[PDB]
């Protein structure tokens, strides 16, 4: 279960974050880890599409090869905090699993600037038992986390040394499909 009410970044600039570009997860903190794919890759695009706030997600287990994309319509709870009802899609946006109540994640942007961000998310999917996930994002997939986002981790009363890096996983991304998915 999720336990954190994440605080959104003061002064969060939604138009800069939701600019239709791609964000790569470089480091993440699963508060309730299992015997985890401690090998994971994830990336997302976030943007406004025909007036609608959207996110496209990509997940890839580099060991199992399990792959999936998602498109979501975001609803605003407050500045920097969103509820997203996701649908699973192929890379072209064809629906594989339709939007369904009970399938949603919340997402809070705790810190962001033009190159980096820290987010909190809470996934709800069916009768899955899921917990809080924090993720350090960068505009460049190979960027080591800088002082601004690591300080924000600390300000969140989290330890960055506990975050798991994805950089060792040899991830490759279809950033083109993520951007085009924003419109689907
Ligand atoms: C993925 N939570």
From Swiss-Prot:
**How many cofactors are bound and how?**
Binds 1 heme b (iron(II)-protoporphyrin IX) group per subunit.
Keywords, A to Z, come to:
Disulfide bond, Heme, Iron, Metal-binding, Oxidoreductase, Secreted, Signal, Vasoactive, Vasodilator
Q: Where does heme bind?
A: 59
GO MF terms listed in the record are: histamine binding; metal ion binding; nitric oxide binding; oxidoreductase activity
What is the enzyme's class at the highest EC level? Answer: oxidoreductase
* Subcellular localization, as worded in the UniProt entry: Secreted
CDD domains tied to this protein:
lipocalin_NP4 (cd19456)
Reaction(s) catalysed by this chain's protein: 3 nitrite + 2 H(+) = 2 nitric oxide + nitrate + H2O
What Gene3D superfamilies does the entry give? 2.40.128.20
> Any extra remark in the record?
Superposition of the structures of NP4 in the presence of ammonia or nitrite shows a conformational change of the protein upon NO(2)(-) binding.
What family is reported?
Belongs to the calycin superfamily. Nitrophorin family.
Protein name (database record): Nitrophorin-4
Q: Which organism is it from?
A: Rhodnius prolixus (Triatomid bug)
């Amino acid at each position: 279960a999720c336990t954190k009410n994440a605080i959104a970044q003061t002064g969060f600039n939604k138009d800069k974050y939701f600019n239709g570009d791609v964000w790569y997860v470089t480091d993440y903190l699963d508060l309730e880890p299992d015997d985890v794919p401690k090998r994971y890759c994830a990336a997302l695009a976030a943007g406004t599409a025909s007036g609608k706030l959207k996110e496209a997600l990509y997940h890839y287990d580099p060991k199992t090869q399990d792959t999936f994309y998602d498109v979501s319509e975001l609803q605003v709870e407050s500045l920097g905090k969103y509820t997203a009802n996701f649908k699973k899609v192929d890379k072209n946006g064809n629906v594989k699993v339709a939007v369904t109540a009970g399938n949603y994640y919340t997402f809070t942007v705790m810190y962001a600037d033009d190159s980096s961000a820290l987010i909190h998310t809470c996934l709800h999917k069916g009768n899955k038992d899921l917990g809080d996930l924090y993720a350090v994002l960068n505009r460049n997939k190979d960027a080591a986390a800088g002082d601004k986002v690591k300080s924000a981790v600390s300000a969140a009363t989290l330890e960055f040394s506990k975050f798991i890096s994805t950089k060792e996983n040899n991830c490759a991304y279809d950033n083109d499909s993520l951007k085009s998915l924003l419109t689907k």
